[PDB]
Design a protein around this ligand. Structure first.
Ligand SMILES: O=C(NC[C@@H]1CCOC1)N1CCCC1
Ligand SMILES: O=C(NC[C@@H]1CCOC1)N1CCCC1
Lengths: 193, 193
C-alpha cells in the first residue's frame, strides 16, 4: 500500500536523474514500480502529482530540519549560526537535485507546485525576518532595511544561487563555494551599517 | 519590410501583456500585424522566434545602456554608482515586463533563449567582478570572497528579485522598494569586511 506508493516515488526520483518529466511516461513509472498502469492511477492521478508529492516531501524535510535547528540553537558565533541555517537547504535540496530541478521547472506550469513553493518561501522568509528582528532588538544588528524585505531578497538569492549551482548552470557559483558565498552576503547585509 | 517585422514584434509584446505565449497563435500575430499567416512565416520561423527576438532586443538595450554608463562615470558616491548600474536593469526590464516574464518562462524550453540569457549574464557578471577588482585594487573594498563568485551570486539575486517584483510573485519585494533593497545588499557585501 504505502510500499507501492514509495516504489512509484523512488522510480520517479531515479528516472528524473536521467530525463525530464516530459520524457517519462506513466508506463515507465508503473514498470519501474512493478505494477500495471491502472494500478498506478490508483495511487496517483498523473505523473505530475508524483512530482508534486516528491517536492512536497523534500520541502517538508527542509522545513522540519530548520525547525529542529530553531529549537536547538548551535553554540557558535553569528556567522556560523547563519551558515548552519543555510546549510539545511544546501544539504537537503543538494541531496535531491533531480527533484529540485524538476520541481523548479514545474513552477511554470503547475499551480499546485507554484503554491507549495510560495507557502514555504513565505514561511522561511518570515522566520528569517523574525531572526533579524531579534538580532536588531538585542543590539547585534543595525536598523537598516525593513527586515522583511531584506529577508525576501536574501531568500530569493539563495533559491536562485543554490539551484543554478546544483544544475551546473552557466553562470553559477561552483557547489563547493556556494555556502561560503551566500553566508558572506547574508552576514554583511544583516550586520553591515 | 522592417515595418512588417516591427508590427509583428509590437503585436506579440502587446499580446504577451494579456496571455502567455502558448495562448497566442501565429494567426493572432499575423492578424494583429495586418498580414497573412504565410507572410508572417516569411519574417519569423515561429512565434517562439518572435519572443527570442523581443528578448534579444530588451537584453541588448540593457547591455548598451550599461556600456554607456561604464564609459560615463556618474559623479557620486559608491552607493549611488551601484544604484545607477542596477537601475539600468530595473528600468529596462521593468519597462518590458511582459517580454521579461515570457522570456523567463521560455528558458525552460528554448535552447536559444537559455543561451542568450547565459551569454549576457556572463558578460554582466564579468563586468561586475572587474569593477569589484578595481575597487579592491584602489583600496576601497576589502579582499573578502573571490570577486567573480561574489559577482555571480549578486547578479543571480538581482535576476530573481527583480523578476519576482515585476511579476508580483508571492513572495517578492514590492517594486517601489526593490532598488533600495538590492543596493543595500550589494554595497554591504562588496565593501563590508
Ligand atoms: O537558503 C535558503 N534559505 C535559508 C534561510 C536562512 C535561515 O532560514 C532561511 N533558501 C530558502 C529557499 C531556498 C533556499
Ligand atoms: O541587476 C542586475 N545586474 C546589475 C549589475 C550591476 C552592474 O552590472 C550588473 N541584473 C543582472 C541580470 C538581471 C538583473
Amino acid at each position: 500500500g504505502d510500499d507501492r506508493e514509495l516504489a512509484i516515488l523512488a522510480t520517479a526520483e531515479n528516472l528524473l536523474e536521467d530525463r525530464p518529466l516530459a520524457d517519462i511516461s506513466v508506463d515507465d513509472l508503473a514498470k519501474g514500480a512493478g505494477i500495471s498502469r491502472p494500478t498506478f492511477y490508483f495511487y496517483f492521478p498523473s505523473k505530475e502529482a508524483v512530482l508534486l508529492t516528491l517536492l512536497d516531501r523534500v520541502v517538508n524535510q527542509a522545513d522540519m530540519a530548520l525547525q529542529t535547528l530553531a529549537e536547538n540553537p548551535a553554540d557558535t558565533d553569528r556567522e556560523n549560526m547563519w551558515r548552519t541555517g543555510i546549510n539545511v537547504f544546501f544539504e537537503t535540496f543538494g541531496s535531491h537535485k533531480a527533484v529540485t530541478r524538476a520541481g523548479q521547472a514545474a513552477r511554470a506550469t503547475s499551480v499546485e507546485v507554484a503554491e507549495l513553493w510560495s507557502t514555504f518561501m513565505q514561511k522561511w522568509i518570515a522566520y528569517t525576518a523574525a531572526v533579524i528582528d531579534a538580532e536588531r532588538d538585542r543590539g547585534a544588528a543595525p536598523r537598516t532595511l525593513p527586515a522583511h524585505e531584506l529577508a525576501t531578497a536574501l531568500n530569493l538569492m539563495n533559491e536562485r544561487t543554490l539551484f543554478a549551482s546544483f544544475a551546473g548552470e552557466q553562470p553559477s557559483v561552483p557547489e563547493a563555494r556556494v555556502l561560503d558565498t551566500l553566508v558572506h552576503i547574508w552576514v554583511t547585509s544583516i550586520y553591515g551599517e
